[PDB]
Design a protein around this ligand. Structure first.
Ligand SMILES: *[C@@H]1O[C@H](CO)[C@@H](O[C@@H]2O[C@H](CO)[C@@H](O[C@@H]3O[C@H](CO[C@H]4O[C@H](CO[C@H]5O[C@H](CO)[C@@H](O)[C@H](O)[C@@H]5O[C@H]5O[C@H](CO)[C@@H](O)[C@H](O)[C@@H]5O)[C@@H](O)[C@H](O[C@H]5O[C@H](CO)[C@@H](O)[C@H](O)[C@@H]5O)[C@@H]4O)[C@@H](O)[C@H](O[C@H]4O[C@H](CO)[C@@H](O)[C@H](O)[C@@H]4O[C@H]4O[C@H](CO)[C@@H](O)[C@H](O)[C@@H]4O[C@H]4O[C@H](CO)[C@@H](O)[C@H](O)[C@@H]4O)[C@@H]3O)[C@H](O)[C@H]2NC(C)=O)[C@H](O)[C@H]1NC(C)=O
Ligand SMILES: *[C@@H]1O[C@H](CO)[C@@H](O[C@@H]2O[C@H](CO)[C@@H](O[C@@H]3O[C@H](CO[C@H]4O[C@H](CO)[C@@H](O)[C@H](O)[C@@H]4O)[C@@H](O)[C@H](O[C@H]4O[C@H](CO)[C@@H](O)[C@H](O)[C@@H]4O)[C@@H]3O)[C@H](O)[C@H]2NC(C)=O)[C@H](O)[C@H]1NC(C)=O
Ligand SMILES: *[C@@H]1O[C@H](CO)[C@@H](O[C@@H]2O[C@H](CO)[C@@H](O[C@@H]3O[C@H](CO[C@H]4O[C@H](CO)[C@@H](O)[C@H](O)[C@@H]4O)[C@@H](O)[C@H](O)[C@@H]3O)[C@H](O)[C@H]2NC(C)=O)[C@H](O)[C@H]1NC(C)=O
Ligand SMILES: *[C@@H]1O[C@H](CO)[C@@H](O[C@@H]2O[C@H](CO)[C@@H](O)[C@H](O)[C@H]2NC(C)=O)[C@H](O)[C@H]1NC(C)=O
Ligand SMILES: *[C@@H]1O[C@H](CO)[C@@H](O[C@@H]2O[C@H](CO)[C@@H](O)[C@H](O)[C@H]2NC(C)=O)[C@H](O)[C@H]1NC(C)=O
Ligand SMILES: *[C@@H]1O[C@H](CO)[C@@H](O[C@@H]2O[C@H](CO)[C@@H](O)[C@H](O)[C@H]2NC(C)=O)[C@H](O)[C@H]1NC(C)=O
Ligand SMILES: *[C@@H]1O[C@H](CO)[C@@H](O[C@@H]2O[C@H](CO)[C@@H](O)[C@H](O)[C@H]2NC(C)=O)[C@H](O)[C@H]1NC(C)=O
Ligand SMILES: *[C@@H]1O[C@H](CO)[C@@H](O)[C@H](O)[C@H]1NC(C)=O
Ligand SMILES: *[C@@H]1O[C@H](CO)[C@@H](O)[C@H](O)[C@H]1NC(C)=O
Ligand SMILES: *[C@@H]1O[C@H](CO)[C@@H](O)[C@H](O)[C@H]1NC(C)=O
Ligand SMILES: *[C@@H]1O[C@H](CO)[C@@H](O)[C@H](O)[C@H]1NC(C)=O
Ligand SMILES: *[C@@H]1O[C@H](CO)[C@@H](O)[C@H](O)[C@H]1NC(C)=O
Ligand SMILES: *[C@@H]1O[C@H](CO)[C@@H](O)[C@H](O)[C@H]1NC(C)=O
Lengths: 301, 226, 210, 37
């Protein structure tokens, strides 16, 4: 049970609890900061979100979540066949083909809605789907020119070790050193306008030169899918994207800013039973990345 | 430019309404922020409240339950009505113009700013005493002199502070030196002024000290001569 | 309350703010001599109004961590007053109270000798059945004197009132001193003195009834 | 910290009791290279 108070809106909390020390018969009244999304109610009495569903494991603070280029290789006696077709959509017969032993440097970027740091398309912007006439199939649109997105958590957080047992140290969020600010992301409104246009162009080749193409925000679901979910310098952001998909297109300095929240108790994939606590990152977090793809979903104009 | 001047009772009985006013000179009253500050003896500067150019009330929570600052734009004059006064309310009340600053540190869009006020021009001050004792006018007694000589005026028992002393209705200003009052055990202040005077002009020029005690509406003069 | 601080004449003063900010700050500095109107020295962390000497300078918060300090270079004797630090910051709320008064006292000022002037009782108040001696002291530094009345050669100590040394415009101090007497006690004595001891020296001014 | 004491490891590391059936006896070990080495 946590005793939580607001911090001097009301997003991040300040929570004190009785904790086990390195001796099994001694307690300690420690305090730690927690984002709203990690606690639930019962000074007000709170509790970590995962407790009634899953055990929780703190990520080792020496492993990095950095996407490193991975190459998949086939064994001897097997091969991999690339596809050199600059305008190759999903399926079909690739005119130009080559054989490779491993794939290119694939960065395993875990993202949502906006495909980050990926590989671009040569020539024109492609669009792929199984059945594009099927509304229940995500459209995988791949850009040809990257639109740059800049994200930052500007709070100057601090990490505080708490010995909770022999050799067991929980890294808690100590306190904010300086201004309390919002985490967010910037995209160039001009470059995002011209990129949505390139997308809206190839969208007509499948739906009509006269029909109007409209972009809306998500219509429901969990935080991971309703927001541009990703990871920046080690902390898991969840950005509102309503400011990127709010345009209606007819037959014929700038910056967009996204309010991103931060979480710490994350279930990563869809596993219900294996939650992870991401330890807090000291300093000011900012990262720069390209949104090179997109994952759209047409409404079942 | 812009200058202010306060005016008030100077003496108010305990458990009563302390009225005060402040006329500003050289600027419009309804396009600046105005702030009241008092300074009790021994205590620090205490910010009373402030009124915006949009006529918005915001008071120190130390008082609040007794303050109500008003403002009349027909003149360049705004008021101050502290009620239920006690003994501790004795202070020099100042009238200062506040200006608004916006301190932005993050994104103006998310509201990552705060407002700070700073007072740049001040009123001269108005002494206010709280006492159940009634007002009482003084009585000027002349101090006659005897290269250089010295003559003055004794302003005996009066209440309360202050009194203003002028010589020759304002003509004699060089060499004047008024001294701080003295609170006798009887409860009345006694002040004394003195003017250093060249010795040859003692028998020729005339010297009259103008003593005024506002809480008693008394204006008295006297002559000094050997 | 009050914080004591002492600098030398013509040196540099480092007045640290009473409360250190938690976030980005907007600090105002005020100069307040007692019984006088406060003077705004610096309103934005480093901005001074029109009519403030350049020797006054406050620190701006370009990088967080640097605390707000008021710097007074070439301290004059007229720089003796209370200095308040009006601290605003993003974390704390609306700062109503001003700072803790830092009372700066300049050391090494010229030691000036008092000017004693004793007046006899006036004819109007003598005719009003009351006598009053007035012993005016002025232009002394450091502002601390002790007054001693004497009837002929005997001490009085009964019926005396003395001002606390108030500061003059010329950065020296002055204080009055009134000895209340009956019209017959002043006539039945040969002389009356006003011993004014300043620092380690006394000055006598005598007045007789003739 | 009768006097109050505590095991040395508690503030640094967890601790595991050696199974009382395994022996610390040095037994002659021979390192062998694979075929072709
Ligand atoms: C992603 O997208 C995001 C959104 O698109 C984007 O967010 C942006 O983030 C940045 C960085 O985080 C933000 O930048 C901040 O901006 C603050 C605001 O600055 C603006 O306003 C001030 C004040 O304006 C008033 O005063 C001036 C005169 O000074 C007048 O001309 C104005 O008209 C105005 O006066 C009227 O309005 C007032 C209301 O505001 C009324 O009250 C008043 O009565 C009047 O009616 C201006 O000074 C700024 O001008 C600057 O900008 C122009 C272009 O616009 C430039 O060409 C030029 O360089 C100008 O300097 C601007 O208009 C800044 O205050 C802030 O910088 C201060 O704060 C930080 C942290 O607190 C400090 O570290 C820093 O040093 C600054 O402190 C100085 O200033 C304060 C305040 O005066 C001092 O108290 C302090 O001591 C310090 O003084 C020192 O520096 C002074 C110069 O700055 C100097 O004069 C002093 O002598 C001393 O040395 C910070 O930069 C930005 O606001 C966000 N954008 C938005 C839209 O919110 C994000 O970055 C993007 N990228 C990412 C996330 O990667
Ligand atoms: C999250 O919530 C926790 C509480 O669970 C906060 O932790 C407390 O934070 C407060 C400040 O906000 C701390 O209070 C400060 O304690 C300092 C330590 O002094 C102690 O020890 C001395 C002996 O040296 C004693 O004499 C003294 O009485 C204290 O017991 C003080 O120095 C501070 O004093 C300041 O305030 C007083 C009154 O306001 C002023 O008069 C002083 O001049 C001075 O400015 C203050 O009292 C408290 O100790 C913290 N608790 C713990 C357990 O650490 C977190 O700060 C909060 N974090 C966030 C981000 O919200
Ligand atoms: C998309 O790709 C981007 C670039 O490929 C990613 O940006 C990288 O983000 C990580 C973490 O967010 C950064 O690593 C940090 O580096 C800083 C210090 O780096 C600086 O100093 C070193 C000196 O060794 C210098 O070589 C660098 O060039 C920097 O000047 C550390 O303090 C941190 O602890 C952490 O290690 C990368 O530096 C950064 N790369 C670039 C080129 O900016 C981005 O995160 C990717 N986006 C996503 C969503 O994965
Ligand atoms: C943190 O601040 C928020 C915002 O003021 C508080 O939210 C209020 O919660 C109460 C329930 O106790 C509601 O009745 C109010 O309507 C809420 N206000 C708003 C604006 O939503 C919250 O309670 C605060 N938390 C703590 C621990 O103090
Ligand atoms: C984001 O933008 C571009 C991808 O289009 C990358 O910058 C270019 O990278 C290529 C190959 O790495 C170079 O040949 C170009 O010279 C680069 N251009 C510039 C202007 O530097 C950038 O590395 C991408 N960042 C990622 C993918 O993390
Ligand atoms: C964030 O806060 C930390 C401290 O919480 C700052 O680290 C300090 O950096 C200065 C140098 O600029 C050192 O002299 C201090 O010793 C550091 N303090 C500690 C505790 O290590 C850091 O500079 C801050 N950064 C930002 C961007 O605000
Ligand atoms: C994202 O951040 C990058 C770098 O932090 C910005 O690129 C800078 O842009 C300015 C203005 O054109 C140039 O003066 C700098 O040289 C650029 N930096 C580098 C390293 O080249 C970029 O503008 C930001 N974009 C958004 C949308 O926030
Ligand atoms: C810790 O335990 C004590 C035992 O009575 C209790 O009073 C206190 O409230 C507990 N602290 C917290 C933060 O729950
Ligand atoms: C866990 O607790 C939450 C409280 O937010 C509740 O809504 C949910 O039904 C609970 N789930 C399970 C599986 O107990
Ligand atoms: C890809 O192209 C081929 C031939 O151009 C076409 O038959 C196929 O339908 C295309 N794929 C999609 C998803 O439209
Ligand atoms: C989508 O937009 C609507 C209206 O702009 C808003 O009410 C809704 O909360 C938004 N949904 C998300 C997930 O941002
Ligand atoms: C996203 O932002 C819009 C307005 O910018 C807001 O109406 C909506 O509520 C936000 N999304 C969520 C999930 O709150
Ligand atoms: C563990 O405790 C010992 C007491 O002997 C102390 O000297 C040492 O610093 C402690 N080490 C750690 C890592 O806490």
């Amino acid at each position: 049970t946590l005793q939580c108070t607001n911090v001097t809106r009301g997003e991040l909390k300040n929570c004190s609890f009785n904790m086990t020390t390195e001796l099994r018969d001694k307690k300690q009244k420690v305090y730690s900061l927690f984002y709203r999304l990690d606690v639930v109610q019962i000074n007000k009495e709170y509790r970590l979100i995962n407790c009634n569903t899953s055990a929780i494991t703190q990520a080792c603070p020496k492993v990095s979540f950095e996407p490193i280029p991975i190459h998949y290789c086939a064994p001897a006696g097997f091969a991999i066949l690339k596809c050199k077709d600059k305008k190759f959509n999903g399926t079909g017969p690739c005119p130009s083909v080559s054989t490779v032993q491993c794939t290119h440097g694939i960065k395993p970027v875990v993202s949502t809605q906006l495909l980050l740091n990926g590989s671009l398309a040569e020539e024109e912007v492609m669009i792929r789907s199984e059945n594009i006439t099927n509304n229940a199939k995500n459209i995988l649109v791949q850009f040809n020119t990257p639109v740059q997105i800049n994200c930052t958590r500007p709070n100057n957080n601090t990490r505080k070790s708490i010995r909770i047992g022999p050799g067991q140290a929980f890294y808690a969020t100590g306190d904010i050193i300086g201004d309390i600010r919002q985490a967010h992301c910037n995209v160039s409104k001009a470059t995002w306008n011209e990129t949505l246009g390139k997308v809206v162009k190839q969208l007509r080749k499948h739906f009509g030169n006269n029909t109007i193409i409209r972009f809306a925000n998500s219509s429901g679901g969990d935080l991971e899918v309703t927001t541009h979910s990703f990871n920046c310098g080690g902390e898991f952001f969840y950005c509102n994207t309503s400011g990127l998909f709010n345009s209606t297109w007819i037959s014929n300095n700038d910056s967009i800013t996204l309010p991103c929240r931060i979480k710490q108790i994350i279930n990563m994939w869809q596993r219900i039973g294996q939650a992870m606590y991401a330890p807090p990152i000291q300093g000011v977090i900012r990262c720069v990345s390209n949104i090179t793809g997109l994952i759209l979903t047409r409404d079942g104009t | 430019q812009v200058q202010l001047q306060e005016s008030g009772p100077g003496l108010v009985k305990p458990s009563e309404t302390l009225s005060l006013t402040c006329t500003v000179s050289g600027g419009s009253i309804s396009n600046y922020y105005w702030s009241w500050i008092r300074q009790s003896p021994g205590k620090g500067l205490e910010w009373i409240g402030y009124i915006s150019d949009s006529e918005s009330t915001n008071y120190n929570p130390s008082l609040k339950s007794r303050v109500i600052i008003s403002v009349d734009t027909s003149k360049n004059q705004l008021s101050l009505k502290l009620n239920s006064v006690t003994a501790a309310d004795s202070a020099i009340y100042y009238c200062a113009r506040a200006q608004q600053g916006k301190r932005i540190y993050g994104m103006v869009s998310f509201g990552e700013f705060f407002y700070y006020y700073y007072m740049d021009v001040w009123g001269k001050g108005t002494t206010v005493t709280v006492s159940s004792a009634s007002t009482k006018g003084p009585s000027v007694f002349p101090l006659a002199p005897s290269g250089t000589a010295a003559l003055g005026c004794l302003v005996k028992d009066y209440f309360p502070e202050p009194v203003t002393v002028s010589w020759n209705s304002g003509a004699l200003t060089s060499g004047v030196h008024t001294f701080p009052a003295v609170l006798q055990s009887s409860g009345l202040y006694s002040l004394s002024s003195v003017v250093t005077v060249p010795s040859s002009s003692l028998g020729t020029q005339t010297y009259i000290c103008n003593v005024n005690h506002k809480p008693s509406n008394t204006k008295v003069d006297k002559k000094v001569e050997p | 309350y009050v914080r004591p601080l002492s600098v030398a004449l013509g040196e540099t003063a480092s007045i640290s703010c009473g409360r250190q900010a938690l976030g980005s700050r907007a600090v105002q500095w005020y100069q307040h001599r007692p019984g006088q109107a406060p003077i705004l020295l610096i309103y934005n962390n480093q901005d001074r109004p029109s009519g403030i000497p350049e020797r006054f300078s406050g620190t701006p918060d370009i990088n967080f961590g640097t605390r707000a300090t008021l710097t007074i270079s070439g301290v004059e004797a007229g720089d003796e007053a209370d200095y308040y630090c009006h601290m605003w910051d993003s974390r704390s709320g609306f700062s109503w109270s001003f700072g803790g008064a830092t009372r700066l006292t300049v050391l090494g000022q010229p030691k000036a000798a008092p000017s004693v002037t004793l007046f006899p009782p006036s004819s109007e108040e003598l005719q009003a059945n009351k006598a009053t001696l007035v012993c005016l002291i002025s232009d002394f530094y450091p502002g601390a004197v002790t007054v001693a009345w004497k009837a002929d050669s005997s001490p009085v100590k009964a019926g005396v009132e003395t001002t606390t040394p108030s500061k003059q415009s010329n950065n020296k101090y002055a204080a009055s001193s009134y000895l209340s007497l009956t019209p017959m006690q002043w006539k039945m004595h040969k002389s009356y003195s006003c011993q004014v001891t300043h620092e380690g020296s006394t000055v006598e001014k005598t007045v007789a009834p003739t």
